Amino acid sequence: SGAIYVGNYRVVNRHLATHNDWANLVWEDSSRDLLVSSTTAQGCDTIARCDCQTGVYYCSSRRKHYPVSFSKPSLIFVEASEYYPARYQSHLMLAVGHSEPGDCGGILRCQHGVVGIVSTGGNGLVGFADVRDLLWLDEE
Ligand SMILES: [Zn+2]
């Protein structure tokens, strides 16, 4: 589980979104496994605005923050998980690392802020849904 709280936005994995999230929907994209909802309270998270490919992500299944190198956001085939069929996912970044389904929503950060959230796993890779292109999270 996990979310990004930037301004009056909450960013979650679309597959983990709640009824409240859907009742307060701003934007969602199945192909990216992202959903953004509106919040009453101001969040304090900063979204990274950069092309960094090194960062640190939180892995709940190991209670560990792992430094990782990660790929550029791309359209990648993802094998079946417990929450999606085998399919293409867009704006996805891969690293070598541990990811179980319960690790979805772990934050990946660099010196510039939040890069993305864990969205995929298996075959010894961890996949992160990028958020750095969503410049509208910074305003309004
Ligand atoms: Zn960065």
From Swiss-Prot:
It catalyses: Selective cleavage of Tyr-|-Gly bond in the picornavirus polyprotein. The active site is at H15 (for protease 2a activity), D33 (for protease 2a activity), C104 (for protease 2a activity). Zn(2+) 1 binds at C50, C52, C110, H112. Homodimer. Cysteine protease that cleaves viral polyprotein and specific host proteins. It is responsible for the autocatalytic cleavage between the P1 and P2 regions, which is the first cleavage occurring in the polyprotein. Also cleaves the host translation initiation factor EIF4G1, in order to shut down the capped cellular mRNA translation. Inhibits the host nucleus-cytoplasm protein and RNA trafficking by cleaving host members of the nuclear pores. Counteracts stress granule formation probably by antagonizing its assembly or promoting its dissassembly. This is Protease 2A. It comes from Coxsackievirus A16 (strain G-10). The chain holds residues 869 to 1008 of 2193 of the full protein.
